[PDB]
Symmetry: D2
Subunit: 493 residues, 4 copies
């Protein structure tokens, strides 16, 4: 675990359009905070509708037929992405430090997980660029028919604050590999890593207007994306509420394509035959990773009665071992929550747990004199009508529940409007296969949890989202299929 051996200096704080830095049209700036100290870190230009319009015009122009982005070899798009990945690898110390400081993310995770996942995903995406293929099709009649899998066009991409760099790369990686141009709006909480990457996009050699980054607020810069008449597609990760607003604004404006990833209330089912220690460890890391601020948080754990008390006890001993503090100090193993809204929401939900009658096993309150810290918290004997069983908490708050009937527990796992992920822990082949098939979730892990790789499509069932990101599948949402059918005198198979 190497570290930056010189204090981090923030440099890129402006709006990035056509590979140059622009001040906000209004001249307004907004503050950016560190969540562990509540101290301001810098001011960033505040983008709004007028700046979005500028980014969109640049993106549109970069996408015109005959332009350098449209006419370069697909293999050269791939090369640009590969080069960006090498540049990110060059600035890894810096970016991981910036991510940790701005995002409240543990430095060891920022460096070993986030940054590594950024680099690997870009390289994965680089590899697809010249391997996106259409078809030739044996249509009835004397015709030659082929399809092109073209890029869609200008894609607006609204990113959240929990994984600012991973999510930036998950969005722009596929979009760019397929040949699209993008207008990115980072989360207001966490604009900084995105703007450093924009400096690397320029340095890699991407043509101007291919990537534009407009820091700003949601109901301002985000709503101007979602309602824009010349944006062909919008991709969004974040809250359900906003997902609904995005889909509505899309329908009202120009029927732009929409893909969403919206969090979850993901269940694990631990059968009596499970390797218990393995199940406790993965369920634990499933819910507590990054202060609970993961979409796939393992936030309902159903354990068969006969091993339930052992499961609860082992889980509590594990939750009691954290050291809270500044995510930059080695040995610190739990950072702060991102901000006051999230902090309030977590405390309120913990309170509802106590009031509705859940059994509190540890934690249950705030921590420290500054920073948005919450004690890791475990509730046992949770039941299905409680707020902590139904609502995404997005904090370090584990719910543990009992079951004795397998048909019953699968219905309880499925009885939610969410559907992002689930975990099954069993040694039996048949149950692993039949349970995983019956679960209404986009990713199901068997005997593990939270395993996410560039090679696999990732996305929700139900209100956890639509579409898929990554894997071969993800690239489909970033193309528009055109059929060309040509009259010929006579066809031959």
């Amino acid at each position: 675990l190497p570290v930056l051996l010189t204090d981090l200096k923030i440099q890129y704080t402006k709006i990035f359009i056509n590979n140059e830095w622009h001040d906000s049209v209004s001249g307004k700036k907004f503050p950016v905070f560190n969540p562990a100290t509540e101290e301001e870190l810098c001011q960033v230009e505040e983008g709004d509708k007028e700046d979005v319009d500028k980014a969109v015009k640049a993106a549109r122009q970069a996408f015109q037929i005959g332009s350098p982005w449209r006419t370069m070899d697909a293999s050269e798009r791939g090369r640009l992405l590969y080069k960006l990945a090498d540049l990110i690898e060059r600035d890894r110390l810096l970016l991981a430090t910036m991510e940790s400081m701005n995002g409240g993310k543990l430095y060891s995770n920022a460096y070993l997980n986030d940054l590594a996942g950024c680099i690997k995903t870009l390289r994965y995406c680089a590899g697809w660029a010249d391997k996106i293929q259409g078809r030739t099709i044996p249509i009835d009649g004397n015709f030659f028919t082929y399809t092109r899998h073209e890029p869609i066009g200008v894609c607006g991409q609204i990113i959240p604050w929990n994984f600012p760099l991973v999510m930036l790369i998950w969005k722009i990686g596929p979009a760019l590999s397929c040949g699209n141009t993008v207008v990115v709006k980072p989360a207001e909480q966490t604009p900084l890593t995105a703007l450093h990457v924009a400096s690397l996009i320029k340095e890699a050699g991407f043509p101007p207007g291919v990537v534009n980054i407009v820091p700003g607020y949601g109901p301002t810069a985000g709503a101007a994306i979602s309602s824009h008449m010349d944006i062909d597609k919008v991709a969004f990760t974040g809250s359900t509420e906003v997902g609904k607003l995005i889909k509505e604004a899309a329908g009202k404006s120009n029927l732009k394509r929409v893909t969403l990833e919206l969090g979850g209330k993901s269940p694990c089912i631990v059968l009596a035959d499970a390797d218990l220690d393995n199940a406790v460890e993965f369920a634990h890391h499933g819910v507590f990773y990054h202060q609970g601020q993961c979409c796939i948080a393992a936030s309902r754990i159903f354990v068969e009665e006969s091993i339930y008390d052992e499961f609860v006890r082992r889980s509590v001993e594990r939750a009691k071992k954290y050291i809270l503090g500044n995510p930059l100090t080695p040995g610190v193993t739990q950072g702060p929550q991102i901000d006051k809204e999230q902090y309030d929401k977590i405390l309120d939900l913990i309170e509802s747990g106590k009031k509705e009658g859940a059994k509190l096993e540890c934690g249950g309150g705030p921590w420290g004199n500054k920073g948005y810290f919450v004690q890791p918290t475990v509730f046992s004997n949770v039941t299905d009508e409680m707020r902590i069983a139904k609502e995404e908490i997005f904090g370090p708050v584990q719910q543990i529940m009992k079951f004795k009937s397998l048909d019953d527990v699968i219905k309880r796992a499925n009885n939610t409007f969410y559907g992002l992920s689930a975990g099954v822990f069993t040694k039996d082949i048949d149950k692993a296969i039949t349970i995983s098939s019956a679960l209404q979730a986009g990713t199901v892990w068997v005997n593990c949890y939270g395993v996410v790789s560039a090679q696999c499509p990732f996305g929700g069932f139900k209100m956890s989202g639509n579409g898929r990101e990554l894997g071969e599948y993800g690239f489909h949402e970033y193309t528009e299929v055109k059929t060309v059918t040509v009259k010929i005198s006579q066809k031959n198979s």
Copy 2:
């Protein structure tokens, strides 16, 4: 061209849920008319929110894990579809007559085109059922990862009145092949063929609740589909306005998946080197097929100056050869428009053409003492700001325009919020390829027009829709991808 040698008797007029006929919960019925006579043909049960709720519960139940539709072999879903196609082939005379009478569709087309396309598309779809495959994926780490391409669930499908039977099959064919259950709402104008097919679904042996058909109105039965909390996906073909309402209602309710096909203002570009007679014929059939009531109507024809006057003259001579009347009488080559709304809209747009200064070459008014007939109408010297150049007419109304610059005419072809289809007529390889690539349209025909086959994906760019129907691609919109990732002790390539 064989005919039904016994008068058509209407038999199925009720709501179809769980393979039985139901009266409307309200007890209300609505009338159904013949467009060529304006006479009522029968009354049909009027479905509303309460009946949609019943159809959805049946569909949901038919989709439960462990049910006959979920556990039967994929090859047996395929077999059911094949059998349905054979039954439709058995009742071809009847269905074509019913289609013609209710839909105002020329009998020869109903029999030779629609019914044939219904049968072929079903058989195409039957073939995919056991050929829908997921993947195994060489994920980083010691895991086994696979995907399932599962059915999505309960699909609501809202069909229009222009191609009632083709569009029913385009919707249910893929949906069923992939393993979904469906709630279909036929157009209020044209419920009858759908309900006859429901009798054939029962006779083929589909399990109850797999297909449910709820005739009724749009803002009642359609809005209850689009806003329903237990419908996983909605597919819709029809007007832009309603498309926007559907997408909005989806976002407000349960973030159901949405696919739309929304018509167009599709352009042809006729270059000076084109086979002129071939271009005139295909552009003509492109705009006048089924009384102009096609989504892909070739409604802006740009012709290079040097052949423009010849193109116009030949086009007018062709338009002057129709015989209007009842679509059942042989020799009749133009039927009525579907109803009064559409009829009024077409007359109004024709009037705007005259007023805005287009040159009228033939037609321009109504015809007959009954039926919603419009004379085939040709406008030359149309220019791009006129209503007849911008708005989908959906009537027999051809627009012909001039160009001399190729870069310019491609911008004019693209300068529309629509993007369903386009045609290019040239003998030159390079232009065919480069023009077809630059056109912002879902299907581009070269030296032909209106060629649509089950083997090709079909759908819009821009506001002409999202998603694709048919071909291999179409089946993708009817699956939900699940990733299953299993921990293993050691992987080996």
Copy 3:
């Protein structure tokens, strides 16, 4: 289990070329026998080099550019195949009776398994015909590149006597769906079902010369196929020895494409945690199905020491329950071996088992006064250097072996030049996955055996064959890929 209620009358006994019946050029005929009685059933025209040349010229002509087979819609090839499947379904009683009588195959299996598999496989293949697609490829430079997946051309197909009808359909199904023409040489032992199917090919409406069937001998009619200068591809199922001759003759002549399926010595590994009864049943049916005359015969069964004696005992009790006799009489559960060569080979191998020191548990000799019957035979304490552990017996002869080390038993399972299939019986997820990955075999069954479906590719590792048949994969071996690359003025993604 319905039966033919009228004595079977043999009708088609000639060479089938250009959809007509031809006598041998030489005028020679050969006899065909029933294996259960050793009585002659009829004489069949004997095809040789001169008749193969005639069939090849017909096939070549049917494949010319501009011919009806090359220019018909792919969907219509599919329709012909579907129709053939319906005709086979019509003549099911007859064909199953013919298969049983000529092939020594139990009537219940012939009817319920073979004929059903013939019908299902044809229908599967019918479905692929218009779903074979090439690609469009984003090549470097200003080019348009696409591929066609064309048929290869004239395919020679040499079929064995164990599954005459299944294997005929496995060969012609894919070949025809892809658009090839074929010259089929059925086994000399079993020409009759093939020639009845040829009558159905004519009746279905296949153009002449698309399918040609040349009954005859191996070193005559088969060698003329394998060495022919105008046959593009040869597919073969049968002995290793002949496989080597085919591959050699291909290399010496015209470098025709070659695919082989060559039998095996397929192992099962039964772990201590296995459901024992399930493992005994499937291993039993694995080796004894169709008198042991299956390529995938489970001919080495390794069982963990701690359950080995129980496994052996249960296996012997199951083997002792057969009734030998004429495969047409209900209640008969073991038929004869196909002929004297096979009969001698099985007796000789049984003798070597006794002499080399294997423990004989039941059977071990011939049965009856006529027919090529062998008693079902079980050997325990078999060890790896014995002939019965190394050589494919192709008779009802089960070998059961002991193991205690899992690494060791996987090496023993793999230590063979064969590699067709294998079985693993365990309840543990990890072992199922890691064992199946380590086994050098084309199909691995987990907790079952002998499960073969049209949807799965099927074929050998190592000397068990090359290429794959069926599934999506199988269709690849029946196409030839052509790349077409077109210069254009400017490409755009």
Copy 4:
């Protein structure tokens, strides 16, 4: 065009097995010559059967289950390949100089074409490694079925002398991306670039035994590959004669998988409407590139009568513009032929042209006092029974022929046992499509020639080879498909 500014020093001259340098078991060495001077350049260790056995054992061991090559992430195989490409890019000057000196290849081509194609192809292949996916398959019955696309195993790869570096990378790139281990035998004429790349394989970090390189002779080291009992697959580019020997030896030994690329006699058809200058240029470069020593050499040019004399005249003026000499000196535009065998064969064929009555337009003899130089030579009025129209010359020798009937000229183009490539030059869409479909060739170029990219599959019809290399398709020949079918209690779609 940069150059090596220091004399080339040859360093790697030994056999490469398990990432170390080995002397021949026999202690024998063979000489390596420069073709432009006929001077010896160095001695190289001579590998034979005994050294092949050593390389095969190393490859086999590197492929064992549990080894580092089998257990590393697919993405890390990809990373190794990417790193190798960067190392080759680092040593580009050196390798291009070495290629030119040893291979008689023009330095500008070696640097700008060969080395660039090596680098691009490796990077293309790097991208596929973690994108090779199997399937999940909806088999009939209650089973879970998936396929693995595993590597095949030990692949022997025999490379020719015309494109030593390109062909090395075309072989090892896909093989390695898919996870195979390889034993490479470079051409005796040109072992040197291969052994330098082996030093880069070691430096990149490939595990030992993954790549082994055994320089030596064909009937010794090559025949030991083709007949080896533990080599799973052999890939070969070279002469037809040897292709037949390889396929035969494969069949006699262990039925190893075989893929061949075997040269051609590729035709161009120039229609009267063609851009004539474009056709002359591309046909010219088609036949004369690399001294005619290309498999895809455009060695029969059929030109429509009405433009034939103009075509011939322009072609001759172009052929007259070369400067022969040492391929290292700038301004030199034609190098020597590779060696005496090839030199003799070319002179002999030129002589047969003169004797059989072809019209000689220029060249026709040797050149210089040292080096294997041949004058660029043009023959017009060639007719189809002449040796120069039938036999692959593999020298700078252009044949130009007349036609007036299009059906006739397509038969003449197809009337050959070769089938590698062809060219069509026309401005007409229909002819481009219908001619390209009727030509029996693996790649057909339209309005260009010799366009080969990593993204496209490449290979022969007929005796020009079997299988395909590169593109998505190429990777298929380097996997072995395994089906795993698992019994389950109940399946659900």
